Structure 1
Amino acid sequence: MKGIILSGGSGTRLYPLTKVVSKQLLPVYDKPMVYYPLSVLMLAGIKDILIISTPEDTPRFEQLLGGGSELGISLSYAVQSSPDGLAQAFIIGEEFIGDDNVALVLGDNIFYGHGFTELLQRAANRKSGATIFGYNVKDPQRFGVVEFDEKGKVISIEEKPEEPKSSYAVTGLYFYDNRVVDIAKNITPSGELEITDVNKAYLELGELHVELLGRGFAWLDTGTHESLLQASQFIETIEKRQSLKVACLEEIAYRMGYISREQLIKLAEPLMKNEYGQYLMNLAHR
C-alpha cells in the first residue's frame, strides 16, 4: 500500500503565521506539523509516500524531508496547482499509485491514542474496500459526518450536513483499494472534487468500513491560532508527563526496523547540542 499526504491549501485562517510560512511547516510543539500525518503513514507500515502541496510550498517540504532514505522510506513530491478538492490527490497521484492500494492523510491532521497503530496496521492490511475513521466531536456540522447504528455498519455520510445524523466527524485519514483511482476520475464537482463522494462510492458498494475512535483517542483541530496552540500543549503535555514522543519520525523508523542502531546514532548526533537528539541517543543505546 502507498500513502499520500495532501498538504497544500491556503494559509488564510492562520494569517499572519502563514503569510511567509506554509501551514504544515508550523510548529506543533517541537516538530513541523507535517511530521504528524507522515508518522501515521509510517505507523501503518506504508513506506512509499507522495507529498502533495502547492507550487510555492512543495520545494520547502522536499527541503525538510528529502527522499526519505534516512527514515528508511521513499518520499516523492507533486504539485497541486489549485485546491480543487481532496479527491484530486488520486488524479494527481494516479501514476504514483499505479495498481496499488493507497491511504490518504491530510497534512494538518493530528491523531493520537494508545491502540492507534494496531488500528492503522489493520486498515493497511485490508486489501479490499475503504476504511475511514470517525471521531466524536462537539460540532459535527463542520465536517464529514458518518451514521452507523449497528453493529457499527455505515448507513450514510454527509459533508457538513445542515443538521447532523451523528456526533461522528469523518477525520482526514482514508484507506482505499486500488478502485479509488477510477472512482475519483468518475465523480463530478459538488466546485471541488470531494472526498465525501469518493466515500459515498464505496458506501454504495457496501464496502465502506468505519473505525470509531472513542475513549481514549485524540484528534486535534489545527485550524485556528487557538487550536494550533491547544494541539501544541497536548503534545508537550503527553510527551513530558508520559515520557514518550509523538510523531518522532526517527524513533518510528528505528522501532519498525527500517534503520539500524548506527543509522539512528548518525541522525541524533547533529541534533545533540539540542534536546531532540538526546531522546534519540537514549533510545539508540538500549
Structure 2
Amino acid sequence: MKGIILSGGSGTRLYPLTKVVSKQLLPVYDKPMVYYPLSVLMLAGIKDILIISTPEDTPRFEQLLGGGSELGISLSYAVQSSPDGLAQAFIIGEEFIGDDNVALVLGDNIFYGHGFTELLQRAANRKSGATIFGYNVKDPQRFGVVEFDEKGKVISIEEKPEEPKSSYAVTGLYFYDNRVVDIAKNITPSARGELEITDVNKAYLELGELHVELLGRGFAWLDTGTHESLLQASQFIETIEKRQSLKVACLEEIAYRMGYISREQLIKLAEPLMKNEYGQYLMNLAHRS
C-alpha cells in the first residue's frame, strides 16, 4: 500500500509563522510537524510515500527528509500549485498511486495513543472500501462529522455542518482502495471552493463501503491549526516524552522497530547526531537487546 502526506496549504491562521516556513515545518515540541504524520504511515507498514506541498515548500521537505533510504523507505515529492482541496491529493498522486490502495494523512494532524498501531495495521490490510477514523471533539462543526448507528455503521458524513449530527470528527487519516483516484476526479468544488475529502468519503458511503474506526477518549488527536493549538500540542508531546524514556515520532527509531533498517544502519544514522540528545537516543536504542 502506498501513502500520501498532504503537506501544503496557506497556513493563513498561523501568520506570520507561515510567511517563510511551511506550517508543516514548524515545531511540534522538538520535531518538525511533518515527522508526526510520516511516523503514522511508517507505523502502518507503509514504505512508499508521496509528500505533496506548495511550489515553494516542496523542496524544503525534500531537504529535510530526502528520498527515504536512511529510513529504509521511499519518499517522493510532488507540487500542488494551489490549495484547492484534500481530494487533489489523489489527482496529483495518480501516477504515484498506480493500481494500488493508498492512505492519506494530513500534514497538520497529530495522532497518539495506545492501541494505535493495531488499528493502523488493520486499516492498511483492508483491501476494499474506505476507512476513516472518528474522534469525539468539543466543536464538531469545525470538522467533517460522522454519524454512526449502534453497530458502528455509518449513517451520514458532512463537512463542517452547522447542526452536527454527532460529536465525532472525521480525523485526517484515511485509507482507500484504488477506486479513490476515479472518485476524486469526479467530485466538484464545495462552497469553500475545495475538492473535499468529505465528498470522496460520501462516494464510498453511497456504495455502503465507508467504514469508521472509533478512536476512543483515551486517544489524543490534536491539530496545529492555530497558534494556541500548536503550542498546546507541543506541550502535550513534551509531557509524554519527559516522563518516559521513549520518544514520539522518532523516524529513525520507527524505521528500526518496523525492520525497515538494521541495527548497523541505525548506528550509522546515530553517529553524525551524537553531538545531540537525539543521536544519543538513537545510539542507545541500537545497542539495546
Question: Shift of residue 11 of structure 1?
Answer: 2.4
Query: 1:269: how far off?
Result: 1.4
1:19-74 Cα deviation digits (max 9, x unpaired): 11111001111100000000000000000000000000000000000100000000
- 8 Å CA contact 2:28–2:230 kept in 1: the answer is yes
- Find the counterpart in structure 2 of residue 180 from structure 1: 180
Residue deviations 1:259-282 (CA, integer Å, cap 9, x gap): 111110111111111111111111
Secondary structure of 1:18's counterpart equals coil
CA distance in 1, matches of 2:77, 2:148: 36
Q: CA deviation at 1:215?
A: 3.2
Superimposed CA distance per residue, residues 81-133 of structure 1 (whole angstroms, 9 cap, x where no aligned partner) = 00110000000000000000000000111100110011000000000011000
Q: CA deviation at 1:244?
A: 1.6
The worse-fitting range, judged by mean Cα deviation, of 234-243 and 192-201 is 234-243
Q: Displacement of 1:234 after TM fit?
A: 0.7
**Shift of residue 205, structure 1, vs aligned partner:** 0.7
Structure 1 residues 194-234: Cα deviation after superposition (integer angstroms, max 9, x where no partner): 10010000101111110111131100120111111111111
- Tell me the equivalent position of 1:71: 71
Residue 243 of structure 1 and its aligned partner are, at CA, apart by: 2.2
Q: Aligned partners of 1:45 and 1:67: how far apart in 2?
A: 17
> C-alpha separation between the residues in 2 aligned to 1:16 and 1:180?
35
| CA distance in structure 2 between the partners assigned to 1:123 and 1:201 by the alignment | 18
> Secondary structure of the residue that 2:3 maps to in structure 1?
strand
Does the aligned pair in 1 maintain the 2:14–2:227 contact within 8 Å?
yes
Aligned length: 286
Moved more, 94-103 or 12-21: 12-21
For residues 129 and 245 of structure 1, the distance between their equivalents in structure 2, rounded to whole angstroms, comes to: 33
Distance in structure 2 (CA, Å) of the matches to 1:243 and 1:118? 22
Task: Report the aligned-residue RMSD.
Answer: 0.7
State the alpha-carbon separation in 2 of the partners of residues 129 and 149 from structure 1.
18
Identity of aligned residues (%): 100
Structure 1: state its 5+ residue gaps. Answer: none
Mapped to 2, the partners of 1:71 and 1:175 lie a distance apart of: 22
Whether the 8 Å contact between 2:110 and 2:223 is mirrored in structure 1 is yes
Deviation at 1:242, TM superposition (A): 2.5
Matched-pair contact (CA < 8 Å) for 2:9–2:53: yes
Q: Match of 1:19?
A: 19
Structure 1 residues 187-196 or 199-208, which shifts more?
Answer: 187-196
2 CA distance for matches of 1:243 and 1:116? Answer: 19
Structure 1 length as normaliser, TM-score? 0.99
Which is worse superposed, 34-43 or 206-215?
Answer: 206-215
Q: By how many angstroms is 1:77 displaced?
A: 0.3
| Contact 2:135 2:169 (C-alpha < 8 Å) held by counterparts | yes
Q: Is the 8 A contact 2:135 2:217 kept in 1?
A: no
Which segments of structure 1 move beyond 6 Å, counting only runs of 4 or more? none
8 A contact 2:11–2:225 mirrored in 1: no
**TM-score scaled by length of structure 2:** 0.98
